[PDB]
Design a protein around this nucleic acid. Structure first.
Lengths: 215, 225, 35, 138, 30, 166
RNA sequence: AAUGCCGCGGAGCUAUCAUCUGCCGGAUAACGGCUGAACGCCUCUAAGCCAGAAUCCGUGCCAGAAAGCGACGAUU
RNA sequence: GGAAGUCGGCAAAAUGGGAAUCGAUUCCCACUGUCCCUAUCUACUAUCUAGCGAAACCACAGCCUGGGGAACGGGCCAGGCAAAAUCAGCGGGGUGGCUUGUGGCAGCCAAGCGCGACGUUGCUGGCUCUUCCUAUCAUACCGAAGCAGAAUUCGGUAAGCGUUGGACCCACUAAUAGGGAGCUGGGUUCCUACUGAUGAAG
RNA sequence: AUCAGACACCAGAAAAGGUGUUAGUUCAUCUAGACAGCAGGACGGUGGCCAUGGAAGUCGGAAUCCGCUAAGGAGUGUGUAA
């Protein structure tokens, strides 16, 4: 009756709040602004949820909601903004940045390694030996039982005699080159910890000082 | 002891005849049979790709030994001339004016002694003794007249029916001066001659011959060395 | 069994005509043609 | 599979002279005397055409006269001799003076042991077992 | 060419029978 | 080959090289394939396709509904039951057991017909025992004697399905 | 001797009772794909394309419009 | 080869005959163109010719397809078509747009408008003949299936080509698929068409 | 429309199917960035408990709770003996 794309559906029963969620995030942003101190600006990064939970553990709360939603709730104009001189702070407020309550030394120094993501550049030129696959690139003192990985890899490999074997060596990563999705997915099965979580503490919206520096 | 099939048939004795001086293979089918025979006897004795009377049962139509060869009456002049040209000079060929045309079925002959169909003609018996230079004896095998088809002969061993008795076994061995064993070829087929062709130093049987049967033929023919 | 109208039978018949199996007809024609 | 079962070679077209209902002589030493033709293998769909056999053809046979235990089986039979004259492909015309045949299993090795009388070479070539156990092959 | 399996033109009994039984259908639904 | 030999082959040698992408493509284009089938096919195959698509469509609408609120010759031509018998009553058309369905209990019991009282279409058929639509027949109710009315036509349906008068 | 009877009997006729002969080019259907939108993904289809059945159309074979025709020869 | 034909030894050949059961039937042997499977030979007719020379029948005639409410017909409608004169054969011509593959009773829902759809649960006539259709038994090519191979099941396109021999039975066969539009048995007491043959004429 | 329509209450099939097209009616989010697309997160108590050779959300039996949120369902499917 009409050439239109089909919209499949499932039985998840986990529908989101949408506008209600945005309103709740705005209310939480206002509460975080009204919170006591420590005036942090850091919400998330390429790090995993486990890293975010670990960071939140050293606090008594990291929360930003949708990016620029809290900035819109606060307001670019100082009259709408709860803080002072927030006109310049709103422009700097981009990406995943949020407040917390618990610090500076841990954020500056403690940067746990994590699996890399696409778009960045690999720290070196990772290569994979030919023949049977190596789980840890020779660091395992490495089972070859990843038979389903032979079908799900797409690399030049053939499942011979129940063991995934690569006909020729394939360089997974190259130094100075942007990481693609295929390279990132291939490196996910290996130990490529090319990441370093960071935080931003340029300024602090103190109750008395009210000096949000841009250092 | 080797296993071979002419075309897709277990009967190689019917389609070929083997002696201690030459080999004969059927013509017009697949030469894979000729190829197999040449692979084991090409450097020893000549192999002739021949037919007898425009027919491929040359094994059961012609009987011979290391000395001479016999052909039936129905053998054409061209084929007889072909056989003479192919075979070497020290081998003689003879036409037989025998009523029983199937020479390979009525005569089982080794290099020294031959046992023949009981009702063979006297003139046939005399020319057999003249050409083959063997002692000829009229007797039946397990009460069965077709000696050439129901018994296989070599210089050092021979086989007969499993239906023969022990006293018949002893009498046949005594009259042939060669060890004789009651056995079967091609997995229970009692046509030993049709399923087996043997010279004094090698043996050919059908591919359907059992391992036990091959061991029996090897044991009687002393072909391990 | 496939007939003569078979497209396969036509195809390998064409393959026979594409090779030396018809070259015995070319030189055959050339012999009378020259003489 | 019975139709061309263990033939070890194709047969040339031969004059048919033994149709069904034919009565014909047993040629082996198994003990049977006479055979009655019931059907012939490899006959297609020809309207009103009486099924017929030639030398070396395999037929369904009933032992009309013979040993009782040889009977009560519709047994395959190989027509080895035929009275009707037929053209051998080399050109000569042949005809044996009686119609003879042998009792054989479907595989192609007979129950008999020795054939009394002449054997057509066409029969002996499609059936190496008959050739192996034949006495005179013409 | 018609290019059909069934003719698009109808017989006079058939066309008359529609007005015969279409009216009865309205009578039945009434 | 023993037991699960093919996945032993799958385990040892892998699956066919193009299987995953071919099945992905086939599943993707199945949406167009179903519509092409619906618009091209004719006859019985179209009609069974129509009925099965209606069934599945109503079925998927119901489960998405269930997903919703959970989230929230003088012879007798009629079958008979056993001078006056001038006509011929065939024993073939004759019947002896009927499926009587209780009204309150809602259970159908196959019981023999004790007798027939009267046929509303024709009282003459009552003497012959001809069972017609609406005919009154009495059957034993010990396992449940009570009367009942025929709820169908024995001549057409063949099976005498009746509703108990209770 | 109304073909007296019998044997052989050329020629002719004839017998799957005898012998010979029975072939290749396109377009498709089921179906398998390429590119590719519609619908920023996908997709054999919508525009196009490829392979593809003893199928359809031709070639071949038979007839030759007796109201279809051309070339050539002679022309009282 | 020897009743395999036919409802069946009708008719011929054996010269008709041997044994059983109640002249009939059956059986075994015997015979044969009833048959496989038709071929050949002779006479007459038919053919042409010379002579003679009718009759039945006759509103008028003469192509087919679809329609003409019916009765579809040859005349009417719309088409295919359509070329003199003839010869010999053979006999053809003298009632739903129905219907199909999925049973009857009761209850529960309930997209919706007291009904209420699908579901869901409760119980007992045969012998030969031209052509067409596909709704395909086999052959060709495909898809699916514990489809390892072989063999096989189901389904799709497909009607080009085949779909037998004997008394539901038993064989063969790749298969023995289903239907539409000259003859005989047991059971109740002129013209036109088709096919060949000439034939005036730009 | 690879078997269109000229049909004539379109009444027998008729109840309906279609990723064919054009119009509408009623509800949805949307420069606080809409749908889609690519990048990533899609977690940790926890392999919750019976159930078992082997079942870790996904052979199978009731849910199906929580720390974090911007969100990670005692889990939508594939898959793995696990």
């Amino acid at each position: 009756p009409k050439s239109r794309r089909s919209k499949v559906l499932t039985l998840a029963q986990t529908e989101k709040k949408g506008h209600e969620g945005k309103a709740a995030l705005f209310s939480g942003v206002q509460q975080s602004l009204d919170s006591f101190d420590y005036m942090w600006i850091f919400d998330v990064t390429n790090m995993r949820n486990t890293y975010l939970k670990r960071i939140r553990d050293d606090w008594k709360r990291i929360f930003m909601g949708k990016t620029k939603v809290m900035a819109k709730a606060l307001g670019h104009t100082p009259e709408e903004e709860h803080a002072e001189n927030v006109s310049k702070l709103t422009k700097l407020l981009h990406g995943a940045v949020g407040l917390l309550f618990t610090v500076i030394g841990y954020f500056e120094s403690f940067v746990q390694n994590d699996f890399a993501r696409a778009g960045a550049v690999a720290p070196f030129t990772h290569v994979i030996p030919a023949g049977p696959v190596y789980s840890r690139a020779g660091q395992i003192p490495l089972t070859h039982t990843l038979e389903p990985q032979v079908r799900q890899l797409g690399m030049p490999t053939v499942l011979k005699n129940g063991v995934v074997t690569l006909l020729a060596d394939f360089p997974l990563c190259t130094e100075g080159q942007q990481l693609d999705s295929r390279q990132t997915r291939l490196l996910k099965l290996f130990g490529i910890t090319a990441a370093e979580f960071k935080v931003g503490l340029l300024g602090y919206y103190s109750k008395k000082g009210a000096s949000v520096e841009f250092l | 002891a080797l296993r071979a099939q002419f075309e897709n048939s277990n009967e190689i004795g019917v389609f070929s005849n083997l002696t201690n001086s030459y080999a004969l293979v059927a013509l017009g089918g697949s030469e894979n049979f000729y190829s197999v025979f040449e692979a084991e006897l090409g450097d020893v004795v000549p192999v002739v790709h021949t037919t007898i009377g425009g027919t491929r049962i040359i094994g059961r139509l012609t009987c011979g030994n290391r000395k001479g060869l016999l052909v039936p009456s129905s053998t054409t002049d061209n084929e007889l001339q072909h056989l003479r040209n192919s075979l070497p000079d020290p081998v003689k060929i003879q036409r037989v004016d025998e009523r029983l045309s199937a020479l390979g079925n009525i005569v089982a002959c080794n290099d020294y002694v031959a046992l023949v169909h009981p009702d063979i003609e006297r003139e046939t018996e005399e020319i057999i003794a003249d050409v083959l230079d063997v002692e000829v004896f009229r007797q039946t095998v397990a009460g069965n007249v077709l000696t050439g088809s129901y018994c296989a002969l070599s210089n050092q061993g021979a086989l007969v029916h499993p239906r023969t008795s022990i006293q018949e076994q002893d009498e046949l061995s005594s009259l042939l001066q060669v060890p004789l064993v009651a056995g079967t070829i091609n997995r229970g087929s009692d046509v030993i001659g049709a399923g087996l062709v043997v010279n004094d130093w090698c043996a050919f049987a059908g591919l359907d011959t059992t391992a036990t049967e091959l061991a029996v033929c090897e044991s009687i023919f002393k072909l391990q060395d | 069994t496939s007939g003569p109208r078979d497209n396969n039978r036509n195809k390998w018949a064409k393959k026979h005509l594409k090779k030396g199996k018809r070259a015995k007809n070319s030189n055959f024609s050339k012999f009378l043609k020259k003489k | 599979s019975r139709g061309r079962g263990a033939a070890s070679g194709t047969k040339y077209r031969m004059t048919l002279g033994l149709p069904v209902q034919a009565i014909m002589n047993c040629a082996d030493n198994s003990g049977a005397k006479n055979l009655y033709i019931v059907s012939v293998f490899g006959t297609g769909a020809r309207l009103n055409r009486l099924p017929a056999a030639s030398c070396g053809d395999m037929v369904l046979a009933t032992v009309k006269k013979g040993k009782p235990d040889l009977r009560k089986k519709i047994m395959p039979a190989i027509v080895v001799r035929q009275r009707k004259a037929w053209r051998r492909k080399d050109g000569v015309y042949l005809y044996f003076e009686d119609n003879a045949g042998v009792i054989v299993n479907p595989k192609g090795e007979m129950k008999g042991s020795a054939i009394t009388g002449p054997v057509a070479k066409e029969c002996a070539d499609l059936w190496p077992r008959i050739a192996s156990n034949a006495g005179t092959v013409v | 060419v018609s290019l059909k399996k069934k003719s698009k033109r109808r017989t006079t009994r058939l066309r008359s029978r529609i007005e015969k039984k279409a009216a009865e259908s309205k009578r039945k639904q009434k | 080959p023993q037991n699960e030999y093919i996945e032993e082959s799958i385990r040892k040698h892998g699956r066919r090289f193009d299987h995953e992408e071919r099945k992905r493509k086939k599943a993707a284009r199945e949406a167009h394939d179903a519509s092409l089938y619906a618009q091209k096919t004719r006859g019985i195959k179209a009609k069974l396709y129509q009925e099965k698509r209606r069934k599945e469509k109503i079925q998927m609408k119901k489960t998405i509904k269930q997903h919703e609120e959970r989230n929230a010759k003088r012879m007798i031509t009629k079958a008979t039951f056993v001078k006056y018998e001038r006509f011929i009553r065939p024993m073939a058309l004759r019947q002896k057991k009927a499926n009587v369905t209780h009204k309150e209990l809602g259970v159908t019991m196959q019981l023999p017909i004790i007798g027939v009282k009267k046929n509303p279409q024709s009282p003459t058929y009552t003497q012959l025992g001809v069972l017609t639509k609406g005919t009154v027949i009495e059957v034993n109710v010990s396992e449940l004697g009570k009367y009942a009315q025929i709820t169908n036509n024995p001549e057409l349906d063949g099976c005498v399905n009746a509703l108990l008068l209770t």
